[PDB]
Design a binder for this molecule. Structure first.
Ligand SMILES: NC(=O)c1ccc[n+]([C@@H]2O[C@H](COP(=O)([O-])OP(=O)(O)OC[C@H]3O[C@@H](n4cnc5c(N)ncnc54)[C@H](OP(=O)(O)O)[C@@H]3O)[C@@H](O)[C@H]2O)c1
Ligand SMILES: NC(=O)c1ccc[n+]([C@@H]2O[C@H](COP(=O)([O-])OP(=O)(O)OC[C@H]3O[C@@H](n4cnc5c(N)ncnc54)[C@H](OP(=O)(O)O)[C@@H]3O)[C@@H](O)[C@H]2O)c1
Ligand SMILES: O=C(N[C@@H]1[C@@H]2C[C@@H]3C[C@H]1C[C@@](O)(C3)C2)c1cnc(N[C@H]2CCOC2)nc1C1CCCC1
Ligand SMILES: O=C(N[C@@H]1[C@@H]2C[C@@H]3C[C@H]1C[C@@](O)(C3)C2)c1cnc(N[C@H]2CCOC2)nc1C1CCCC1
Lengths: 264, 263
């Protein structure tokens, strides 16, 4: 079904692209000959990614540095990235605020910052991107986690933000089908991935073999390109078997008609 | 369950000036609990305090304020705790005013929903936890079917309800390992016949809303019984598809896998 030609000349934004999965996605897209606009806070790190993207064969590569704690930067970043590429086909929302494993006690500012960066900025970027995505019948790719489908200790604020993404984007996907907005939304449910950040955060706590970041990056892009509603990627075969929630899907399909959406 | 389980218990009910919150305050009052009610309207809260006393509450007080203010949420709990001489049950029920609409660009509404429906619940929990640890108390979190499954027209509301599940379910795992003997009840509600819900839903939703009085009682029962989740919908079959057994399997399987000696 997937062919790398599907990404050739496509106009793609990748957030949190200076390292980890984001950087690997920028690299895969570059190899595929897409036009890429990468973002993160570090201009020096983003420059290195852009240069490697050009070397890999990107149709074009640019960066715009800024913090996703600033909603006005998020809004302006999309307009600028859209002007740089002459449009937008795929919006890959991948960035998160720095998170470490800890028992929750009273760090309200960290809960708020997690909600603002991991969730609110994704909504802001979606609003700013939607008119161009509507023009191109494009795609929104939302990077989530197993911690955004199931409960784990030590990631309360992070988990809340990832569950919020599922709630918001899954509701918006239902709205897009009724309002005939031909923009796909891909929610990516990832297990532990071998990024430097993850390996460091998890040492001495988690035993798990982490999945490779290169293949993870590719599966995200494939799912988005194929307009899949959800992408599941983890190293455990058992979680893979159990993660799907067919009963949630039946329940949503059951009540899809029960609404008189003529008013909207 | 028996109404005696709540007699003399020290309970906070948020969003208690009307709807399910008010009904919970009335049930608790009938049971002889000490209640502290909150919402923004002092005049409506005063009427709630008077009817609670007239229903047989051991004590009833109100503190008015907005849950958009995190510092109010923090101070409200300290004050409610002083008024009752402790805390046994924290019922988190308030939400910001929400109507059915397609999402377009209302970022202010998304943020406000996250602050009031989610962040304030976290704030109130942090402020309440020392007293709840003393009494081996309970946190009851009022959610919705829209907090477990996706529906159109409630994007920001659903995000905030999903966030509650993510946060409080993670905190429940942490409490079991750190031996914090405080139960956490997540209440997954279907459509309830509150005046707010009936108005918001008219001509859009073609389904019988469940009664608010029974809903209020099922929330209290679930909390008093320290149940992890309370399901209450007018249909028994959504109450069948709403459960997520594979999630429970996935969580129980991985509970041993963690080394907590760092904590
Ligand atoms: N690694 C895993 O095991 C794992 C598991 C499940 C899901 N995920 C999802 O995978 C995505 C990528 O994680 P990853 O492990 O690759 O992370 P990473 O290697 O730590 O990268 C975080 C990316 O976010 C950018 N970032 C951090 N703070 C930011 C802010 N305030 N504004 C803008 N960008 C910011 C960082 O760049 P700078 O600091 O310059 O800003 C960097 O580009 C997250 O959505 C994560 O939830 C990862
Ligand atoms: N009704 C349903 O069908 C239904 C279905 C699923 C779940 N639920 C859950 O049930 C709970 C109660 O809903 P309900 O239908 O009973 O709602 P309601 O009757 O509309 O009452 C909302 C309560 O919230 C208080 N409130 C609103 N904004 C506030 C703010 N900024 N600060 C403090 N308090 C505020 C309101 O008081 P004032 O405005 O004076 O402040 C009032 O006491 C919500 O958690 C809701 O998500 C309801
Ligand atoms: O999203 C996940 N991890 C992320 C990594 C590591 C940490 C926490 C987040 C954000 C980070 O930046 C920091 C990057 C993540 C993904 N899959 C699993 N599943 C399996 C792992 C153990 O068994 C289930 N667990 C986690 C967290 C690791 C401990 C509890 C949940
Ligand atoms: O939490 C829910 N409703 C709330 C009521 C009505 C509205 C929206 C929220 C917040 C309110 O303040 C305003 C109070 C809620 C609860 N159960 C259902 N399932 C049933 C609906 C149709 O089929 C199943 N649906 C809703 C929403 C109503 C339409 C889409 C989802």
């Amino acid at each position: 079904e997937f062919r790398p030609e599907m990404l050739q000349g496509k106009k793609v934004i990748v957030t949190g692209a200076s390292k980890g999965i984001g950087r690997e996605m920028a690299y895969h897209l570059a190899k595929m000959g897409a036009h890429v606009v990468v973002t993160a806070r570090s201009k020096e790190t983003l420059q290195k990614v852009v240069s490697h993207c050009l070397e890999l064969g990107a149709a074009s590569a640019h960066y715009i540095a800024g913090t996703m704690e600033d909603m006005t930067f998020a809004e302006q970043f999309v307009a600028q990235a859209g002007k740089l590429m002459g449009g937008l086909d795929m919006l890959i929302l991948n960035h998160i605020t720095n998170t470490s494993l800890n028992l929750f006690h009273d760090d309200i500012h960290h809960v708020r910052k997690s909600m603002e960066v991991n969730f609110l900025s994704y909504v802001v970027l979606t609003v700013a991107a939607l008119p161009m995505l509507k023009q191109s019948n494009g795609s929104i790719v939302v990077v989530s986690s197993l911690a955004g489908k199931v409960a784990y200790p030590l990631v309360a604020a992070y988990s809340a933000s990832k569950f919020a993404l599922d709630g918001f984007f899954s509701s918006i996907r239902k709205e897009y089908s009724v309002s005939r907005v031909n923009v796909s939304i891909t929610l990516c449910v990832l297990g532990l991935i071998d990024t430097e950040t993850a390996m460091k955060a998890v040492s001495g706590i988690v035993h798990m073999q982490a999945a490779p970041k290169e293949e993870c990056a590719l599966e995200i892009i494939k799912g988005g390109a194929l307009r899949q509603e959800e992408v599941y990627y983890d190293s455990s075969r058992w979680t893979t078997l159990l993660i799907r929630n067919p009963s949630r899907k039946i329940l949503e399909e059951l009540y899809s008609t029960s609404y008189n959406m003529d008013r909207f």
